[PDB]
Design a protein around this ligand. Structure first.
Ligand SMILES: CC1=C(/C=C/C(C)=C/C=C/C(C)=C/CO)C(C)(C)CCC1
Length: 139
């Protein structure tokens, strides 16, 4: 069965600037973010999912139950709140983020040792791919 648990190091990060611009992330933060190579530390524990998006500058932490809508606090990204649901779709994880921006959400899946993440908002697409790694990063 598909299991996202692991530490995943960024390999490629396509069109991130335009994704952040579509979220109205301010220009100074976009400049910082353009130099980052965020990683993912994930624990899948039943349908309780923890996804820590980690960077040297700032993290964004998700901690939710698959299937259950929650209030997602996007402080540190665009500082909005979304009513968000993450759901299984076969071997993929689908996320719908209801709120100010149309078409906001993402899809996450695995191909071999690669974690794939397509982030979407307002018709803009950012695609990230991470490689599973084994050297422990201190919490
Ligand atoms: C803008 C910005 C950042 C963007 C984080 C994003 C966009 C996280 C998306 C997480 C998802 C979609 C998780 C499912 O794997 C981080 C915090 C890296 C650094 C500071 C500024």
């Amino acid at each position: 069965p598909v299991d996202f648990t692991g530490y995943w190091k960024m390999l490629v990060n396509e069109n991130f600037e335009e994704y952040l611009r579509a979220l109205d992330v301010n220009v100074a933060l976009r400049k910082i973010a353009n130099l980052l190579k965020p990683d993912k530390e994930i624990v899948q524990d039943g349908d309780h999912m923890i996804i820590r998006t980690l960077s040297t500058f700032r993290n964004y932490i998700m901690d939710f139950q698959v299937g259950k809508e929650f209030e997602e606090d996007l402080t540190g990204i665009d500082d909005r709140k979304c009513m968000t649901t993450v759901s299984w779709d076969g071997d993929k994880l689908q996320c719908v983020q209801k709120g100010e921006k149309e078409g906001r959400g993402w899809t996450q899946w695995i191909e071999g040792d690669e974690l794939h993440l397509e982030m979407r908002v307002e018709g803009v697409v950012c695609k990230q791919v991470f490689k599973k790694v084994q050297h422990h990063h201190h919490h």
